[PDB]
Design a protein around this ligand. Structure first.
Ligand SMILES: CCCCCCCCCCCCCCCCCC(=O)OC[C@H](COP(=O)([O-])OCC(O)COP(=O)([O-])OC[C@@H](COC(=O)CCCCCCCCCCCCCCCCC)OC(=O)CCCCCCCCCCCCCCCCC)OC(=O)CCCCCCCCCCCCCCCCC
Ligand SMILES: CCCCCCCCCCCCCCCCCC(=O)OC[C@H](COP(=O)([O-])OCC(O)COP(=O)([O-])OC[C@@H](COC(=O)CCCCCCCCCCCCCCCCC)OC(=O)CCCCCCCCCCCCCCCCC)OC(=O)CCCCCCCCCCCCCCCCC
Ligand SMILES: CCCCCCCCCCCCCCCCCC(=O)OC[C@H](COP(=O)([O-])OCC(O)COP(=O)([O-])OC[C@@H](COC(=O)CCCCCCCCCCCCCCCCC)OC(=O)CCCCCCCCCCCCCCCCC)OC(=O)CCCCCCCCCCCCCCCCC
Ligand code: HAS
Ligand code: HAS
Ligand SMILES: CCCCCCCCCCCCCCCCCC(=O)OC[C@H](COP(=O)(O)OCCN)OC(=O)CCCCCCCCCCCCCCCCC
Ligand SMILES: CCCCCCCCCCCCCCCCCC(=O)OC[C@H](COP(=O)(O)OCCN)OC(=O)CCCCCCCCCCCCCCCCC
Ligand SMILES: CCCCCCCCCCCCCCCCCC(=O)OC[C@H](COP(=O)(O)OCCN)OC(=O)CCCCCCCCCCCCCCCCC
Ligand SMILES: CCCCCCCCCCCCCCCCCC(=O)OC[C@H](COP(=O)(O)OCCN)OC(=O)CCCCCCCCCCCCCCCCC
Ligand code: CUA
Ligand SMILES: [Ca+2]
Ligand SMILES: [Cu+2]
Ligand SMILES: [Mn+2]
Lengths: 576, 331, 102, 57, 190, 143
């Protein structure tokens, strides 16, 4: 290992300015024209949280109308439009774009690149996703309204003969545009990992967030073409008079098979990157390495393989899929998804945990998501899914699970990387208020729905009778739903206030124990990320950079076995 | 599962809101459900306890107030333990899959020797029931009773092709309805009336599902079972018949549509009323003799309430339900 | 091409997953990983056969399902295993040639 | 003899080609301005004539 | 002293993009095969393939594979640094692709002339969706070749323009392969 | 890029295995909750998915076999080994937003199925992609 000369006249490079000091006109034309991956990432994240507010407003209208038996202000049609568009907005305009926004921001900082591979394709992905959102929501401006066939768009209910409004077309092209955005983003991230890593940043030294973005890019590239093909087939059918999805052509189950071959990998595409964010956060605040790193990589790639073979557990009650095959496959993919929890407990096992906001959000994620997945294996068993399919039990399952990942771990990522993004910290107290409001409201909303679903309530029911016995459960659930809706008020205030008046960051790593490479650079990074690079040797280079006296210790304690090769002889001779 | 749950309040908690089940295979599914929740609660309790141990033992201030120093033990790998913790889940899910296959194969069998076969038709947005087969022991007259209305079934069969030649779907007309069933004794639901399907106790029954347009689903929560009803079930390779070995106890049971089908999806309810074997023989005899008589009159004739009780028709008015009263009563 | 081993002084111990002698790049390993994941499906097959038999159905074919399950499982397990070992050969001779394991 | 574009780099003929479909001599995209060029240059040899503008006040 | 060989980044991006375009055409093929299963369930499919014209399809197949050979000759020209060979072969490839799409348009016009339409049968629906999406991909490919010729007309021919030409050749090879597969399914085995 | 090229053979072998298994199973096995027959969607989907991972694995391997030992693929690389040019990157471009707007006009035309909207959207799209691809090559003005 070489050593440089103590060069004369050396002073550290200049720190970039934090947010809130901007002059007018500084971002308008830049936003419109930038190809900076990290401004594009900030734009992605702001956009996706705005859509989160839209979709959640739709959800709270749904919860208001389910508060008591009769139809108090909504119609059946409007309730159907509401749940359809709540589902579509939250999955395709919040979830996938926030995945690609976090990827865009932090990934080149993690692998040590200045840019992404294809900057203008990155810009294109952002703008086409925004246009997809605008198109999808434009259906509400019609007199008939938005699409109202559920976010799955089952056939023949989606045929023109059975859903003739223009919103039903708008929905299709909306999801199509969002998929186009996703494939652009996927191409970018994959090439950027293959072609722009730093010296010594071998594949098995990347952080785990990078590995997850790798495999979900592969999955997205598999699946989003297929959704565009199937939905342009539907639009072909509707506009030209085709008959591919005719019921006498087996078209109903053609659609269901195609849709779920796209759609279950999409929920894994949403889950894995946020597991990766949590695997970044948990070791930083435990002051301990990420336990079982290579095993985590194998588990991630195992999910990537299995996700394409588990698809038809969304079709058990159709009486038209081979039950044991998909049941066993789902039971298998439960295994690597669950190994992640063992790894996070190993990362916390006898650590020195400090409870800043991102650690609180991450442990809340773990607690929330465990119950959702335990609920999931019940649905993996067809004997139970015969009763549980399309019940409110299913609503409770996937809300526990999609909040666990895409909401809890998304806020964990926001709190964790806000200093790096902006050069400013957020208010820890307001963050804890946000967390406790979200936690209490969420469990109060969706825990009691397991019971009302088991008791016999189906999903997508605008109205019910007071003889069903559903009323009291719906009332409790809606009260806590409005609480959960209030939870975003401290979050918006915290972001806004801290963006322009937040505590200034004076250190490269304000949490102290940053593992990944993004904490080896300033807050915020310069335009091309790095003013200088460290030696990459571990998978946590920044930790080795800031605490060299530990580099002897960790190498001794890394393994449980009694490895003695610190007394091994010299190897090689000289050149490097 | 053959094994019964723990029972008592523990069983009530374990089955977590499931009905008791009015068939033998519903009992099997409920058993299996309670036991998998014993398992699930064990897993959830121990792992939430680990997440609490993280809060209350592995903290940094507790570690610093007892002199542990700056950093913990930088352990990262334990190849045996991270093998065992992976292999144990596999052997768990293999046992889960074994019991799953047992229960699924009992529920899903089609060799239960049905004595009453009902043809079910779903449409936007109600149900039509009809008796396809009633084997002799309870049948009207004692001879094995077939229900088909030949003239009407033949009209539906002739609607399979357009005389004007607009036959695009593999040679058949687009509005083919020859897959649907037309019987003599039928009960047809309306916005004003809930269709009440009468069935006998302690008799093996077959249900034969199909839809007139769009996918629906036949969920009786007391059977702990549902299946999707499709248009042209054979073109979709969707097994359209299912069989139950018996209904164990008599009463009135609600049933709902459990697949999104459009505007009035939430208003597509039916009742499954279950009566004595001889009472069912009387009901079917009455209906077969005077086919102009309605369903309510036959129900009165065998001494039951004329209209559904586990559910009620909705007020069709789009605003009258605004202040709570969304149900219209019958005589 | 780059040399076979690199300069390690006594007392230095690396994190060496992407080294030239590591089975994580030798191609045999990843095929063996594929086949080991694939072998579990035969366990699924034999369990489905035995479970269907135990309740009295699949009676014309459950022995054939058991046969194909066990043979598929064992051949995938075996050829995946030996492929893993053929991937892990160079690291093993490295561990012999020098005291270094990490 | 066959044609070569005047903007094309010269190279060691044993080293194959400047670029081919599988491989290049650079990690990103090759520059439109020729990779043989070295920037910056003098402003005199860019040819930009910076205007002198005075407007009536 | 010399520079190390690295993966051509633009080629990697193009190959990833072409993998996901293959996965686009997967779904249309699945639609076709589900339709074909339903059609052979009562022997109606064969009576609709009795309108097909296999010699003409084989002709335009020969034309398209010839055009792919042509664009690879152009690739060779580009990597040697010769703008004129590239600029010749790519124009020949554009001519051959134009001939392809005009022949496919004539095929549609004659099929409509005697029955086959999107609305007349399920066969017609499957046939025209699959062949029409492929023809749209061919038209995008010839658009790509023309834009390359413009690029190398008005910008100097550095390696940065040569990489562009090579990846547009990759795109044309993908459409040629999709055609061979679509021709093998809908014309031969039917 | 050895490990990246080689780890694409895990899912390739797995998806091919699941394809053949699913195919034989759906055509031969019978249970009371489905009708026997080969299920063509999942068949084509899984085999084409194994085709995608095969495609990437084979291309990346065929490239890996003739790239040199790069510093980012080396365990003891010094930071000064990648010193020099890294490559060209676009600093700015208005044409991505332009392309999104063209695709928006096309998609709304497809929605309403106005023919002029489809024509204009396709024209806009070819124009904006062309201008994107001609950005860093437009001539100097010759007056
Ligand atoms: C073209 C229009 C134009 O010229 O506008 C320029 C003008 C900016 O002013 P300027 O004179 O060009 O530059 C001076 C600014 O002060 C310079 O910018 P700035 O100092 O305002 O900072 C950027 C800006 C934020 O950036 C922007 O406003 C621009 C980028 C986003 C625009 C695209 C998405 C918008 C939503 C679409 C939904 C449909 O920061 C904030 O507004 C405060 C922080 C964010 C909270 C406010 C937003 C609430 C919703 C999102 C919740 C997010 C939760 C946390 C996520 C983690 C965040 C790190 O207005 C906008 O950019 C508006 C954007 C559209 C809304
Ligand atoms: C469907 C057809 C799609 C278009 C043709 C096929 C696309 C690939 C062609 C080969 C290729 O990769 O070239 C790259 C290559 C760029 O090389 P380069 O200039 O050295 O770039 C190096 C920089 O680092 C580049 O870095 P950068 O990020 O600054 O530049 C990004 C740039 C270049 O990006 C790349 O070179 C890497 C990525 C590969 C390109 C495709 C990326 C994904 C495109 C968007 C997402 C998927 C869209 C799927 C649409 C189909 C849905 C069914 O992206 C594009 O030009 C892609 C086209 C945008 C399509 C937007 C969607 C509509 O292209 C050329 O140089 C050739 C010029 C002409 C290419 C485009 C021709 C388009 C003509 C058709 C327009 C659509 C209308 C069709 C109408 C049909 C009849 C009604
Ligand atoms: C036939 C069918 C029609 C299409 C065929 C093509 C037609 C164009 C050909 C005629 C012109 C011939 C002359 C020529 O070659 O001119 C090239 C001339 C520029 O020449 P250049 O020398 O390459 O300029 C670049 C210099 O670097 C610029 O240097 P610079 O920095 O000195 O100049 C900056 C310049 C650069 O900007 C431009 O020159 C045009 C900007 C276009 C993008 C607009 C935003 C799109 C957002 C989506 O921007 C400005 O001066 C500021 C204007 C405001 C920009 C937009 C801001 C957003 C809010 C408005 O091209 C244009 O001006 C064409 C712009 C067309 C935009 C694409 C279409 C967008 C569709 C509208 C969106 C509607 C919403 C969709 C969703 C809902 C639907 C229901
Ligand atoms: C982020 C998004 C999602 C993730 C992740 C997710 C994970 C799972 N899901 Fe799911 N889900 C289903 C099963 C699972 C299983 C088995 C897992 C697994 O990934 C769960 C593994 C995770 C765990 C956290 C396991 C426990 C962890 C540990 C560490 C203990 C070791 C594990 C053991 C021993 C196995 C457990 C054994 C026990 C006895 C408890 C099924 C069917 O089996 C359906 C369809 C049902 C229907 O149609 O009604 C379904 C439906 C959905 C829908 C339906 C949307 C719609 O409208 O149709 C969505 C959005 C969704 C999201 C997500 N889901 N899921
Ligand atoms: C990542 C994916 C998702 C997230 C996150 C999500 C969040 C929620 N969901 Fe959901 N959703 C439901 C309820 C909720 C609620 C209450 C929330 C909550 O997170 C929403 C709260 C979040 C917000 C972000 C609200 C922001 C609040 C604002 C903007 C107002 C604040 C101001 C106030 C309150 C006034 C101040 C007052 C003072 C006194 C100060 C329900 C039922 O309660 C159903 C089934 C409906 C049915 O009939 O089947 C449903 C259906 C779905 C479906 C299936 C769609 C379909 O079947 O077609 C999907 C895929 C999905 C995804 C997702 N959903 N959801
Ligand atoms: C831009 C994005 C969308 C692509 C372009 C949109 C579709 C192109 C034209 C559609 C009109 C058409 O061809 O209609 C079918 C046509 C006439 O049908 P008809 O009026 O019934 O005539 C009966 C008399 N024999 O007669 C025929 O059937 C002729 C064959 C038409 C071939 C169709 C080619 C393109 C199909 C794939 C793309 C369309 C995607 C769906 C639209 C969104
Ligand atoms: C697509 C298929 C996805 C993969 C599915 C699982 C199969 C992979 C794991 C076992 C089979 C592969 C054999 C291991 C080859 C290997 O990398 O050797 C172990 C390596 C030790 O490294 P070293 O000491 O240097 O020696 C090897 C040279 N590097 O590595 C280690 O340090 C090993 C540490 C022990 C634990 C390894 C993996 C645990 C797996 C976690 C869950 C997997 C989920 C699969 C579904 C259940
Ligand atoms: C040209 C640029 C695209 C403009 C917009 C699309 C073309 C016009 C169109 O699609 O019109 C529809 C009409 C037939 O559609 P119609 O039968 O009315 O469908 C509903 C009732 N069945 O269409 C027709 O009857 C005209 C069919 C030809 C449309 C041209 C499509 C261009 C792409 C395919 C080229 C094929 C080779 C030449
Ligand atoms: C190259 C040629 C492309 C441009 C052609 C422009 C003319 C538009 C046109 O064709 O109008 C007729 C069209 C009828 O529709 P068509 O496309 O024929 O398809 C069948 C319908 N599905 O009509 C339409 O589809 C809708 C056209 C209506 C446009 C809006 C009318 C109300 C508002 C107009 C305000 C005044 C105009 C302002 C424009 C200038 C502003 C500076
Ligand atoms: Cu229904
Ligand atoms: Ca209400
Ligand atoms: Cu799923
Ligand atoms: Mn369903």
């Amino acid at each position: 290992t070489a050593v440089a000369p103590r060069v004369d006249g050396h002073v550290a490079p200049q720190r970039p300015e934090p947010t809130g000091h901007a002059r007018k006109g500084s971002k308008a034309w830049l936003m419109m024209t930038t190809t900076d991956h990290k401004q594009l990432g900030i734009m992605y994240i702001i956009m996706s949280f705005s859509f989160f507010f839209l979709g959640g407003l739709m959800a709270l209208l749904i919860r208001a109308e389910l508060f008591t038996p009769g139809l108090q202000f909504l119609s059946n049609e409007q309730f159907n439009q509401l749940f359809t568009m709540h589902g579509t907005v939250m999955l395709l305009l919040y979830g996938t774009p926030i995945v690609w926004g976090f990827a865009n921001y932090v990934l080149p900082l993690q692998i040590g690149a200045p840019d992404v591979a294809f900057p203008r394709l990155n810009a294109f992905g952002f703008w086409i996703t925004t246009v997809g959102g605008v198109a999808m929501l434009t259906g509400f401006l019609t007199p008939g309204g938005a699409a109202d066939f559920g976010w799955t768009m089952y056939s023949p209910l989606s045929d023109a003969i059975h859903s003739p409004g223009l919103g039903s077309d708008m929905w299709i092209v909306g999801v199509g545009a969002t998929g186009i955005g996703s494939v652009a983003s996927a191409i970018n991230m994959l090439t950027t990992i293959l072609c722009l890593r730093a010296p010594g940043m071998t594949m098995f030294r990347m952080p785990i967030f990078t590995w997850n973005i790798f495999v979900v890019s592969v999955l997205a590239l598999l699946i989003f073409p297929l959704l565009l093909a199937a939905a342009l087939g539907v639009l072909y059918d509707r506009k030209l008079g085709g008959h591919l999805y005719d019921p006498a052509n087996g078209g109903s189950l053609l659609w269901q098979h195609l849709f779920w071959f796209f759609g279950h990998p999409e929920v894994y595409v949403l889950a894995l990157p946020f597991f990766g964010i949590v695997s970044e956060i948990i070791p930083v605040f435990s002051r301990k390495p990420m336990f079982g790193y290579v095993g985590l990589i194998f588990a991630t790639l195992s999910i990537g393989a299995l996700s394409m073979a588990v698809w038809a557990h969304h079709m058990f009650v159709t009486g038209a899929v081979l039950l044991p095959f998909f049941s066993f496959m789902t039971f298998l993919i439960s295994v690597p998804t669950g190994v992640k929890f063992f790894n996070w407990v190993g990362t916390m096992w006898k650590g020195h945990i400090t409870w800043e906001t991102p650690m609180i959000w991450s442990v809340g994620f773990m607690a929330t998501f465990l119950f959702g997945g335990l609920t999931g294996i019940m649905l993996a068993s067809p004997p139970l899914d015969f009763h549980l399919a399309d019940s409110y039990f299913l609503i409770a399952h996937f809300h526990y699970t999609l909040f666990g990942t895409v909401v809890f771990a998304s806020c964990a990522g926001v709190y964790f990387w806000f200093p790096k993004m902006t050069g400013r910290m957020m208010d820890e107290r307001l963050g804890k208020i946000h967390f406790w409001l979200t936690f209490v409201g969420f469990h109060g909303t969706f825990l009691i729905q397991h019971w009302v679903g088991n008791m016999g309530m189906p999903r997508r029911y605008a109205d019910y009778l007071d003889s069903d016995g559903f009323t009291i459960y719906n009332q409790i659930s809606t009260v806590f739903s409005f609480l959960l809706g209030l939870s975003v008020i401290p979050f918006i205030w915290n972001v806004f206030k801290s963006w322009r008046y937040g505590e200034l960051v004076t250190v490269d790593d304000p949490w102290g124990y940053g593992n990944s490479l993004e904490w080896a650079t300033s807050c915020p990074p310069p335009r091309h990320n790095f003013a200088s690079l460290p030696r990459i040797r571990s998978e946590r280079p920044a930790f080795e950079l800031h605490y060299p006296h530990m580099i002897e210790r960790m190498r001794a304690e890394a393994h449980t076995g009694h490895h003695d090769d610190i007394n091994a002889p010299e190897l090689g001779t000289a050149p490097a | 599962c053959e094994v019964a749950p723990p029972g008592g309040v523990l069983g009530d908690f374990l089955r977590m809101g499931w009905p008791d089940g009015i068939t033998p295979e519903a009992v099997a599914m409920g058993n299996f459900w309670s036991w998998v929740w014993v398992a699930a609660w064990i897993i959830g309790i121990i792992m939430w306890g680990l997440f609490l141990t993280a809060i209350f033992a592995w903290g940094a201030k507790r570690a610093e107030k007892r002199g542990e120093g700056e950093f913990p033990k930088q352990l990262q790998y334990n190849v045996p333990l991270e093998l065992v913790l992976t292999i144990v889940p596999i052997i768990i899910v293999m046992v889960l899959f074994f019991f799953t296959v047992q229960t699924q194969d009992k529920v899903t069998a089609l060799d239960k020797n049905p004595e009453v076969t009902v043809d079910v038709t779903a449409y936007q947005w109600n149900w039509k029931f009809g008796y396809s087969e009633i084997d002799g022991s309870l049948a009207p007259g004692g001879q094995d009773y077939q229900g088909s209305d030949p003239e009407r079934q033949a009209a539906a069969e002739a609607s399979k092709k357009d005389p004007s030649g607009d036959n695009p779907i593999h040679g058949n007309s687009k509005s083919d309805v020859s897959y649907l069933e037309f019987n003599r004794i039928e009960t047809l639901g309306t916005t004003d009336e809930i269709p009440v399907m009468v069935l006998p106790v302690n008799t093996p029954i077959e249900f034969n599902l199909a839809s007139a347009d769009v996918a629906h689903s036949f969920w009786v929560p007391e059977f702990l079972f549902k299946r999707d009803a499709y248009a042209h079930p054979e073109a979709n390779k969707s097994q359209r018949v299912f069989q139950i070995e018996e209904i164990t106890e008599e009463g009135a049971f609600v049933g709902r549509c459990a697949e999104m089908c459009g505007t009035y999806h939430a208003m597509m309810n039916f009742e499954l009323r279950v009566v004595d074997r001889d009472s069912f023989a009387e009901y079917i005899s009455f209906r077969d003799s005077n086919p102009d008589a309605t369903n309510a009159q036959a129900l009165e004739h065998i001494g039951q309430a004329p209209y559904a009780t586990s559910t009620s028709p909705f007020v069709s008015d789009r605003t009258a339900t605004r202040d709570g009263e969304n149900t219209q009563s019958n005589a | 091409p780059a040399p076979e081993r690199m300069h390690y002084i006594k007392g230095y111990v690396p994190v060496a997953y992407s080294s030239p002698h590591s089975s994580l790049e030798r191609s045999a390993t990843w095929l063996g990983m594929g086949f080991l994941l694939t072998a579990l499906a035969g366990v699924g097959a034999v369990l489905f056969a035995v479970g269907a038999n135990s309740v009295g159905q699949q009676q014309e074919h459950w022995v054939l399902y058991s046969i194909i399950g066990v043979v598929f499982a064992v051949v995938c397990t075996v050829l995946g295993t030996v492929l893993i070992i053929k991937g892990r050969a160079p690291y093993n001779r490295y561990v012999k040639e020098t005291g270094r394991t990490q | 003899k066959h044609f070569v574009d005047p903007a094309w780099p010269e190279h060691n003929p044993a080293d194959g080609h400047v670029v081919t479909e599988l491989i290049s001599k650079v990690a990103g995209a090759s520059s439109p301005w020729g990779d043989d060029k070295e920037f910056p240059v003098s402003a005199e040899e860019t040819g930009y004539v910076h205007p002198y503008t005075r407007i009536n006040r | 002293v010399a520079a190390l060989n690295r993966p051509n980044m633009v080629s990697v991006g193009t190959i990833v993009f072409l993998s996901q375009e293959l996965m686009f055409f997967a779904g249309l093929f699945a639609m076709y095969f589900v339709s074909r299963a339903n059609g052979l369930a009562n022997g109606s499919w064969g009576e609709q393939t009795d309108h097909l014209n296999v010699p003409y399809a084989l002709l335009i197949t020969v034309i398209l594979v010839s055009s792919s050979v042509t664009c690879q000759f152009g690739v060779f020209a580009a990597e040697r640094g010769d703008v004129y060979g590239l600029r010749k072969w790519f124009l020949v490839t554009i001519i051959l692709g134009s001939i392809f799409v005009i022949g496919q348009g004539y095929e549609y016009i004659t099929l409509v002339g005697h029955g086959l339409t999107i609305q007349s049968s399920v066969y017609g629906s499957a046939f025209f969706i699959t062949t029409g999406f492929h023809a749209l991909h061919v038209i995008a490919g010839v658009m790509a070749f023309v834009v390359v010729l413009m690029r190398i007309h008005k910008s100097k021919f550095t390696p940065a323009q040569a990489t562009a030409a090579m990846v547009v050749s990759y795109y044309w090879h993908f459409v040629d392969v999709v055609w061979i597969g679509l021709f093998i399914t809908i014309y031969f085995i039917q | 890029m050895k490990s990246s090229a080689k780890l694409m053979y895990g899912p390739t072998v797995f998806m091919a295995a699941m394809a053949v298994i699913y195919i034989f199973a759906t055509m031969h096995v019978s249970d009371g909750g489905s009708v026997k027959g080969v299920e063509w969607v999942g068949s084509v989907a899984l085999v084409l998915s194994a085709g995608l991972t095969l495609m990437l694995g084979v291309y990346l391997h065929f490239t890996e076999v003739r790239v040199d030992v790069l510093p980012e693929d080396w365990e003891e690389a010094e930071v000064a080994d990648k010193a020099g040019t890294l490559g060209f990157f676009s600093p700015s471009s208005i044409w991505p937003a332009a392309m999104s707007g063209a695709v928006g006009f096309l998609a709304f035309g497809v929605v309403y199925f106005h023919y002029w909207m489809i024509a204009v959207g396709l024209m806009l799209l070819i124009f904006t992609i062309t201008k994107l691809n001609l950005q860093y090559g437009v001539p100097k003005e010759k007056h």
